[PDB]
């Protein structure tokens, strides 16, 4: 396209993982109870603090501790850990196929309730003999159709809505999305309202200037499924800092059973796609 001030929206990784020693200690203890199993999936819960993100950070920290296996304004995030008791299976796991499965779960949940399409997953092998723990964190982010992108330009005339959205999100800690109804009241997402009102606000987890979390992809994929003829709409990226921004948005295709593009494995310190090792 060539509209002035228009760009294709780009994204940032949703979270940065911090796994405390206590997480691995609990993992070790629990593994001893499942040695006869080839693999297990156990639910995890982390509470996100979107109000106190370090200035040095690019996105909200995801803190995992022993307690993850079990405050004000915090946002609960559900995930799971898949533990592999056979090293060869962990090493040879098809990580694209695996994250695609996780994304399809999120998609299936999301088309029933858009607020339930967010998760994280850890894959792990715990070498209890050597006290070494190998893992990889993924956040399933899905773009469906794979070939539909979002063109945006700034819309600062909407900035007055930011403070109200901040407060709504604070109160509604289980929600990732809200919309305006026909009379500009902030309400829960409803696919029959949004088709008319065309204003969507998202609880963002990125702090990068003008670059929302990749989770935005999930919500936009659900939106397209719910309202297939939607082209133009307004998108508010809401942050609990000073950095919220509003976008005049337009779906376009660069190319009905559309493909789903999935991504979201966390990169290592070197910027590569590889699992991390913690040696205790």
UniProtKB/Swiss-Prot annotation:
Disulfide bonds: none annotated. It is found in: Cytoplasm; Preautophagosomal structure. It comes from the Eukaryota. Homodimer; homodimerization is required for ATP-binding. Also interacts with ATG3. The C-terminal 40 residues are required for homodimerization, as well as the interactions with ATG3, ATG8 and ATG12; and the C-terminal 17 residues are required for the ATG8 lipidation. E1-like activating enzyme involved in the 2 ubiquitin-like systems required for cytoplasm to vacuole transport (Cvt) and autophagy. Activates ATG12 for its conjugation with ATG5 and ATG8 for its conjugation with phosphatidylethanolamine. Both systems are needed for the ATG8 association to Cvt vesicles and autophagosomes membranes. Autophagy is essential for maintenance of amino acid levels and protein synthesis under nitrogen starvation. Belongs to the ATG7 family. This is Ubiquitin-like modifier-activating enzyme ATG7. The lineage of its organism: Eukaryota, Fungi, Dikarya, Ascomycota, Saccharomycotina.
């Amino acid at each position: 396209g060539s509209m002035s001030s228009e760009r294709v929206l780009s994204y940032a990784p949703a979270f940065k993982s911090f796994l405390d020693t206590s997480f691995f200690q609990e993992l070790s203890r629990l593994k001893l109870d499942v040695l006869k199993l080839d693999s297990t999936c156990q639910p995890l819960t982390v509470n996100l603090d979107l109000h106190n993100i370090p200035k040095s950070a690019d996105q909200v920290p995801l803190f995992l501790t022993n307690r993850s296996f079990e405050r004000t304004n915090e946002v609960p995030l559900q995930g799971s850990i898949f533990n592999f008791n056979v090293l060869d299976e962990f090493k040879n796991l098809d990580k694209q196929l695996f994250l695609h499965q996780r994304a399809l779960e999120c998609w299936e949940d999301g088309i029933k309730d858009i607020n339930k399409c967010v998760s994280f997953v850890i894959i792990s092998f715990a070498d209890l003999k050597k006290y070494r723990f190998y893992y990889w964190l993924g956040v399933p982010c899905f773009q469906r159709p794979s070939s539909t992108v979002l063109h945006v330009r700034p819309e600062p005339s909407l900035k007055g809505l930011f403070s109200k959205c901040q407060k709504w999100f604070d109160v509604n800690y289980s929600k990732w999305v809200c919309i305006l109804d026909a009379d500009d009241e902030i309400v829960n997402y409803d696919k029959c309202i949004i088709r008319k009102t065309k204003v969507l606000a998202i609880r963002d987890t990125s702090t990068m200037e003008n670059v929302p979390s990749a989770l935005t992809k999930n919500f936009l994929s659900v939106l397209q499924y719910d309202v297939p003829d939607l082209i133009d709409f307004k998108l508010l990226i809401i942050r609990q800092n000073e950095g919220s921004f509003a976008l005049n948005a337009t779906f376009a295709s660069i190319d009905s059973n559309p493909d789903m593009k999935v991504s979201g494995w966390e990169r290592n310190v070197q910027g590569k796609l590889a699992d991390r090792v913690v040696d205790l």
